[PDB]
Amino acid sequence: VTLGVYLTKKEQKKLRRQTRREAQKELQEKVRLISQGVHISVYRVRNLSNPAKKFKIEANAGQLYLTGVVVLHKDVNVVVVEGGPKAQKKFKRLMLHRIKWDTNKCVLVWEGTAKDRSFGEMKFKQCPTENMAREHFKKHGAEHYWDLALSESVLESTD
RNA sequence: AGCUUUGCGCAGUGGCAGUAUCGUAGCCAAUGAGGUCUAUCCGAGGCGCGAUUUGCUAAUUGAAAACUUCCCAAUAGCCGUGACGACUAGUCGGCACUGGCAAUUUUUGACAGUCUCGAGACUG
């Protein structure tokens, strides 16, 4: 709604002169007297068993005030984050360029916009089977992203 | 959380500040100011006009260099002498001075300088 009001250097300079003049006058007088849409990303990594990388991902999720989950399974790590656009962009730039995995590769499965946040805080869930992770994702209403990540992992393993 | 890029105003230093700079209530703008470059062209105002804050303090000239009373006329002990009284020609107490008060015991200065651990010594 509001627009930024910028001026040229000369105009500013005139203001400075006036400002200093006013200041001098005063001095001389003192001496003389996440709502409306939240960005939700979901990335798929081959191996997330490293404690240092998981701690760095948890620190990047907690410092950016973004919620979500990090589910681990048999060669399928689904990291879902949700928050603002700048926090999601910083998390994607950290997980795509700063977080060095290497046969272990991390790629972003999906990145969209939702109405509100689903999870409360970043909880590192763990499940050896995919049915428990699917039930944990459906308990918070995010089973479609986990199913899409599992289908993308199956298509990457088959092809 | 640290760090970095950049600008404004403000704070500090430095720097220039009569080819130094702003002011404009004038005038032509990134739809485009204005090229002699580059005129399928650069891209910023063009070029007029109006001119170069405030405060401290010194110094100079002059009779006087500006901070809220002059002047007059004037001012705010002794030795002796003459009377008076007292005590036996003398003495005492008070009054004024018709003369004096720089020559050893009193008031016209034998004073000054230097040194040592209240005291002493040396010199002129």
User: What are A124's two structure tokens?
Assistant: 């590192």
The residues, ordered by sequence, that sit 6+ positions from A44 with a Cβ below 8 Å of its Cβ are A76, A77, A78, A79, A106, A107, A108, A109, A149, A152, A153
Whether CB of A63 is under 7 Å from strand B: the answer is yes
What's the CA–C1' distance between A22 and B46, in Å?
Answer: 32
What's the CA–C1' distance between A28 and B56, in Å?
Answer: 14
DSSP-derived letter for residue A123 is: B
Q: Output phi, psi for A114, to 5 deg.
A: -120, 175
Whether CB of A65 is under 7 Å from strand B: the answer is no
Residue with tokens 């970043």: A122
Phi-psi region of A77 (alpha: psi -120 to 50; beta: other; left: phi over 0): beta
Experimental approach = cryo-EM
Buried b / exposed e across A56-65, counting CB within 10 Å, b at 16+?
Answer: ebeebbeebe
What's the CA–C1' distance between A56 and B93, in Å?
Answer: 130
CA dist., res. A40 & res. A115, Å (int):
10
Q: Output phi, psi for A112, to 5 deg.
A: -135, -165
